[PDB]
Amino acid sequence: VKPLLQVSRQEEEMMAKEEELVKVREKQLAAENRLTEMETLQSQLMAEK
Amino acid sequence: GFQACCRGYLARKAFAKRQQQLTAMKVLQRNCAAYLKLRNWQWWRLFTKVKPLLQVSRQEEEMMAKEEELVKVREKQLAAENRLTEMETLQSQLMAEK
Amino acid sequence: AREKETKALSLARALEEAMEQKAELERLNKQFRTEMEDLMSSKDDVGKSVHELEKSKRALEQQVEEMKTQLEELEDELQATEDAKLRLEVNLQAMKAQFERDLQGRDEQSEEKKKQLVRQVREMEAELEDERKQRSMAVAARKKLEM
Amino acid sequence: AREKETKALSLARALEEAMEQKAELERLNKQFRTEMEDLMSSKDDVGKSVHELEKSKRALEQQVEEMKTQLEELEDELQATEDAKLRLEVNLQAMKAQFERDLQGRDEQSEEKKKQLVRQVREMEAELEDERKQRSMAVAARKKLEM
Amino acid sequence: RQGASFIGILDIAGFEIFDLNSFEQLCINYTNEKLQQLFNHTMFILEQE
Amino acid sequence: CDFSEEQTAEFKEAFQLFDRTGDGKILYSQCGDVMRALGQNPTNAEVMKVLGNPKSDEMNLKTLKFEQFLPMMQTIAKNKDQGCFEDYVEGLRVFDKEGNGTVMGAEIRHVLVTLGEKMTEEEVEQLVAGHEDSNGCINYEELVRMVLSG
Amino acid sequence: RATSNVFAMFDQSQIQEFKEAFNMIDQNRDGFIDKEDLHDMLASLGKNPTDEYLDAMMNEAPGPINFTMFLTMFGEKLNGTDPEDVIRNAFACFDEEATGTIQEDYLRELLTTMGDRFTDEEVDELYREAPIDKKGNFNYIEFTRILKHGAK
Amino acid sequence: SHKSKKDQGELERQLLQANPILEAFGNAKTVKNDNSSRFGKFIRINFDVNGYIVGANIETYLLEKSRAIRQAKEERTFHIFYYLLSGAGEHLKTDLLLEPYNKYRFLSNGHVTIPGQQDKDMFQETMEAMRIMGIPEEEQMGLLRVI
Numbered sequence: 034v035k036p037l038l039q040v041s042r043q044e045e046e047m048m049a050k051e052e053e054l055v056k057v058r059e060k061q062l063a064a065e066n067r068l069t070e071m072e073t074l075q076s077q078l079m080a081e082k
Numbered sequence: 083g084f085q086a087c088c089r090g091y092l093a094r095k096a097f098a099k100r101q102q103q104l105t106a107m108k109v110l111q112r113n114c115a116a117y118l119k120l121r122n123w124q125w126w127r128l129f130t131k132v133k134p135l136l137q138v139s140r141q142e143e144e145m146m147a148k149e150e151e152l153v154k155v156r157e158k159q160l161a162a163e164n165r166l167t168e169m170e171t172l173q174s175q176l177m178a179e180k
Numbered sequence: 181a182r183e184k185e186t187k188a189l190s191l192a193r194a195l196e197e198a199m200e201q202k203a204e205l206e207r208l209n210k211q212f213r214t215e216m217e218d219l220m221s222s223k224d225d226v227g228k229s230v231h232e233l234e235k236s237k238r239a240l241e242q243q244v245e246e247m248k249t250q251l252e253e254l255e256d257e258l259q260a261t262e263d264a265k266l267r268l269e270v271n272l273q274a275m276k277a278q279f280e281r282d283l284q285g286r287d288e289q290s291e292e293k294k295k296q297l298v299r300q301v302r303e304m305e306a307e308l309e310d311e312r313k314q315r316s317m318a319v320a321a322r323k324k325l326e327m
Numbered sequence: 328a329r330e331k332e333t334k335a336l337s338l339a340r341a342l343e344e345a346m347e348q349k350a351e352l353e354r355l356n357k358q359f360r361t362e363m364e365d366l367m368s369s370k371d372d373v374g375k376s377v378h379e380l381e382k383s384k385r386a387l388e389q390q391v392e393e394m395k396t397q398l399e400e401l402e403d404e405l406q407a408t409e410d411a412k413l414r415l416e417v418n419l420q421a422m423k424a425q426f427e428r429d430l431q432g433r434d435e436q437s438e439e440k441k442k443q444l445v446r447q448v449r450e451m452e453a454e455l456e457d458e459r460k461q462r463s464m465a466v467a468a469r470k471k472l473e474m
Numbered sequence: 475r476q477g478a479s480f481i482g483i484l485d486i487a488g489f490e491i492f493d494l495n496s497f498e499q500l501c502i503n504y505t506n507e508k509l510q511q512l513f514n515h516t517m518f519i520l521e522q523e
Numbered sequence: 524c525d526f527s528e529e530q531t532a533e534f535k536e537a538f539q540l541f542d543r544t545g546d547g548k549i550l551y552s553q554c555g556d557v558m559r560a561l562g563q564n565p566t567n568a569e570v571m572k573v574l575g576n577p578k579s580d581e582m583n584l585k586t587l588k589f590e591q592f593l594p595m596m597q598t599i600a601k602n603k604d605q606g607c608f609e610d611y612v613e614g615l616r617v618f619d620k621e622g623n624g625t626v627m628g629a630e631i632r633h634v635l636v637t638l639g640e641k642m643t644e645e646e647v648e649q650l651v652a653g654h655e656d657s658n659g660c661i662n663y664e665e666l667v668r669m670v671l672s673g
Numbered sequence: 674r675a676t677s678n679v680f681a682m683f684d685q686s687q688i689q690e691f692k693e694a695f696n697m698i699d700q701n702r703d704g705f706i707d708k709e710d711l712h713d714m715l716a717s718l719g720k721n722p723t724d725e726y727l728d729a730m731m732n733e734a735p736g737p738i739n740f741t742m743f744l745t746m747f748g749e750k751l752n753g754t755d756p757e758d759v760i761r762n763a764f765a766c767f768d769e770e771a772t773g774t775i776q777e778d779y780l781r782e783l784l785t786t787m788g789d790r791f792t793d794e795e796v797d798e799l800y801r802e803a804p805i806d807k808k809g810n811f812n813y814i815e816f817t818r819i820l821k822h823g824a825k
Numbered sequence: 826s827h828k829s830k831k832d833q834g835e836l837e838r839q840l841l842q843a844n845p846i847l848e849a850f851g852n853a854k855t856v857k858n859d860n861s862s863r864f865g866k867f868i869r870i871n872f873d874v875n876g877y878i879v880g881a882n883i884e885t886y887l888l889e890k891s892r893a894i895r896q897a898k899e900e901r902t903f904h905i906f907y908y909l910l911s912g913a914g915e916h917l918k919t920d921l922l923l924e925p926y927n928k929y930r931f932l933s934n935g936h937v938t939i940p941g942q943q944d945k946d947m948f949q950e951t952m953e954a955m956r957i958m959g960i961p962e963e964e965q966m967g968l969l970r971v972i
């Protein structure tokens with residue numbers, strides 16, 4: 034009966050939505066951290082220049 | 083004369099604020115008055131304990147809301163990574179200039 | 181004069197109340213005249229249509245019941261429409277506050293980032309401003325030597 | 328003060344007139360009701376029952392008239408309420424659209440002022456470096472004098 | 475830090491004479507003489523200029 | 524009365540909305556603010572005048588009935604010292620030292636707090652709040668027109 | 674109380690939720706709560722004890738309760754209440770900084786002073802079960818959950 | 826910034842504490858002034874376009890650092906040396922290795938008092954001033970350890 038049930042399909046779809054959201058959210062936070070750090074490196078290299 | 087106009091405007095604004103805040107209070111206190119008795123009613127506390135079970139009967143809106151959240155986050159992260167790589171290449175050029 | 185104005189207002193209210201009482205007593209007396217002509221002239225009569233008089237009374241009572249049940253509908257309809265208006269009012273006000281929150285957030289982020297730019301620019305302008313004075317000193321010192 | 332005092336006292340005179348007419352009708356109607364009910368009481372009991380039937384039927388007719396009047400007044404109140412609710416819904420939509428426009432205005436103003444700031448800042452940096460060069464020239468011309 | 479205008483408040487070390495005056499007092503009394511010349515210049519010279 | 528009862532019915536409610544005696548009465552200090560809430564612009568001098576020059580403590584203690592408040596409103600409605608927008612803009616321009624249609628918010632605050640019937644700093648900050656620009660300048664024509672039309 | 678069509682009191686979603694509730698709550702699924710159906714549910718969901726005294730409330734809705742009667746008895750106590758979102762929006766008129774909280778004393782003052790007034794006893798009777806902070810913050814956001822989805 | 830959101834503002838409260846601190850470390854009792862400052866300072870207070878305070882900057886001049894080492898026959902060194910030595914608790918005396926006034930030879934006159942003051946209370950006042958200014962206890966202890 035579980036392959037017949039729709040609720041399991043809706044839960045699976047919600048989990049897929051959440052998982053892909055989490056992937057893009059992790060990339061968002063990592064990209065923000067990387068940009069901030071690298072920008073501080075760039076600014077320090079400007080001062081050294 | 084102009085101070086009388088300003089003080090009138092201020093009093094009138096504060097009155098309108100009181101008027102809406104009083105309608106909000108009427109809603110709030112009427113609802114809480116009904117709650118005070120209904121809170122203690124056996125059938126209500128029974129139904130509310132059943133409610134988590136019947137709440138399984140639910141609409142699809144959270145999945146599309148998560149789809150929108152995904153899209154917004156994805157586009158922001160792509161922009162952030164593009165700006166990061168532009169800044170990093172510029173920083174490497176600053177290394178060459180140093 | 182403005183005291184007399186309210187004295188007159190109060191007495192006008194009293195006069196209007198007494199006149200409404202008089203109008204009601206007139207209605208009563210005039211109805212009682214016709215009812216006394218019924219009491220003492222060929223009427224208060226039996227059997228000829230008393231089943232129809234009962235039918236009319238029952239139909240009137242039925243119409244009162246119909247009006248009362250329609251009122252028991254209209255009272256809840258008015259209650260529900262008023263409650264809908266209250267939901268409208270409270271959501272509208274909260275929406276104005278929410279849009280004010282959005283406007284403040286727009287300013288908070290945009291102005292903070294831009295003002296950080298303007299701060300760095302102002303710190304650079306402080307150097308430009310001191311360079312103005314250093315140049316003025318240099319040219320004044322040369323004019324002091326040129327003599 | 329005097330014209331309004333004369334108005335107040337004339338209203339008081341009218342109030343006393345209405346009050347005395349009210350009291351006159353009060354005792355007149357009490358007497359008349361007593362005389363009329365004695366003519367019911369003295370009549371035969373079935374005819375007396377038909378008088379109470381007609382009396383109650385007339386009162387029930389007035390009751391149905393008052394009921395339908397009240398339902399008409401409540402219908403009008405309900406219509407005015409629904410018109411007000413629709414007005415609030417329209418005003419909510421207009422307010423939403425207005426704040427949307429204001430938000431787009433804030434976005435465009437933020438972008439425009441960011442661009443203006445950065446562009447003028449490039450000019451400020453160029454003129455700063457120009458002032459650096461011209462001050463360096465002034466001090467070089469001084470040193471070439473001192474030498 | 476975007477200050478549009480400022481009020482400055484100066485409180486220098488006041489004019490000193492001890493039983494033993496040293497390099498510290500020379501610099502203090504020089505500063506007091508400079509501030510007094512600022513008063514004289516502002517009041518009597520810039521005014522008439 | 525020499526006044527339209529249709530709005531007297533509204534004034535009864537708007538007066539009652541000031542409720543803090545627990546009944547159909549309100550205290551002398553409120554009288555000016557209820558008159559300003561009903562749409563008139565009485566000066567504090569006018570408020571004291573119609574109240575018969577009460578003492579500053581009596582203002583806290585003595586009270587009006589609506590039957591006494593209605594003629595107060597009528598007196599202020601029928602006769603007034605109120606100027607107009609075309610006058611007030613000419614008054615504000617006295618502070619316009621440059622002719623651009625703008626005046627300094629700190630100047631307008633200082634003026635309103637110090638001259639005439641002095642306003643509190645809390646009131647005046649609520650007045651100027653939202654009329655900021657990057658220069659601290661208020662456009663007095665629009666400030667006056669907004670306050671007057673408000 | 675008034676006798677209108679029952680649907681006017683409830684949004685379609687709310688009466689649909691009551692229909693679901695009653696289909697779960699009727700236990701011998703004859704279409705009616707009887708006292709056994711009630712105590713069966715009460716024991717099945719709740720703890721081991723059963724309280725026949727609750728039969729003195731089942732009787733309150735006359736006869737064996739049809740879904741229209743079940744809805745009637747809930748709706749007549751539930752009337753005079755409003756959605757969670759408008760109750761949060763109502764609290765927003767007082768929490769001017771949108772902290773999500775009002776002070777315990779300040780909410781007591783607000784409730785006792787104006788409109789159709791609460792007694793201080795009724796406010797304290799809210800506080801005897803409402804969420805509260807020993808620092809004084811009434812976290813009204815949680816109170817809106819407790820008033821509709823909660824009650825532990 | 827007096828406003829509808831009426832407050833005891835942070836920058837106002839901190840600005841008032843700056844002088845008690847610089848006076849504790851900078852000032853000393855000479856024969857001419859019991860609160861002789863021994864440095865010059867220029868306080869620059871910055872105002873926005875609305876005339877509200879947004880920042881202050883304190884510049885100082887010519888500190889008489891030599892006073893730390895040696896003093897004339899009725900004078901004190903900088904007040905903080907006496908605030909610490911008299912106001913430190915036994916745990917602080919132990920942690921900072923503090924000694925009687927007669928052990929130190931940089932305190933040429935030993936313990937010397939100022940009429941109408943108590944160094945043990947001025948110590949607590951100075952530490953409260955440092956707390957209000959937001960100098961954390963590790964930095965306050967760093968200062969006292971260097972002293």
Ligand SMILES: [Mg+2]
Pocket residue numbers: 699700701702703704705706707710
């Ligand atoms: Mg059953």
